[PDB]
Ligand binder design. Structure first.
Ligand SMILES: Cc1cn([C@H]2C[C@H](OP(=O)(O)O)[C@@H](COP(=O)(O)O)O2)c(=O)[nH]c1=O
Ligand SMILES: [Ca+2]
Length: 129
């Protein structure tokens, strides 16, 4: 897999974001994770987390997996990085997302995220408290 550039257009919530990619505005849905909706417990915390991580970064990148690049709603499916640090993994590590929606052929970073979740659960963080 390889990283590609993008720039923030606007934060949305824990697992979606509006980015410009190849010069076009797109809503991205982060691969392999599920954050609570804003309406839910830890929703606002997830959204604040990704809003901060992505607004403070100098360099946003997206990395597509080997499978579908867009979902049925036209959302881009990617791993997002903020100054080299994967937002999808950071959410999981902090107990602000569950590993979820693991489809075959778009699951390159599955084990990486599961290891993060195991550590979040150990530490009883947020969703796991
Ligand atoms: C993360 C992800 C979600 N989806 C679809 C499945 C879910 O369909 P339904 O809308 O039918 O439940 C929806 C979940 O996204 P949200 O968790 O953002 O709602 O997005 C994919 O198709 N591929 C993916 O990789
Ligand atoms: Ca969600």
């Amino acid at each position: 897999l390889h990283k590609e550039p993008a720039t923030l257009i606007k934060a949305i919530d824990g697992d979606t974001v509006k980015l410009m990619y190849k010069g076009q505005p797109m809503t991205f849905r982060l691969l392999l994770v599920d954050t609570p909706e804003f309406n839910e417990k830890y929703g606002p915390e997830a959204s604040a987390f990704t809003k901060k991580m992505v607004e403070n970064a100098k360099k946003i990148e997206v990395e597509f997996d080997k499978g579908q690049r867009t979902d049925k709603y036209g959302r881009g499916l990617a791993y997002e990085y903020a100054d080299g640090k994967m937002v999808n993994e950071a959410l999981v590590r902090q107990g602000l997302a569950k590993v979820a929606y693991v489809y075959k052929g778009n699951n390159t970073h599955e084990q990486l995220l599961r290891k993060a979740e195991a550590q979040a659960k150990k530490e009883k963080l947020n969703i796991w408290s």
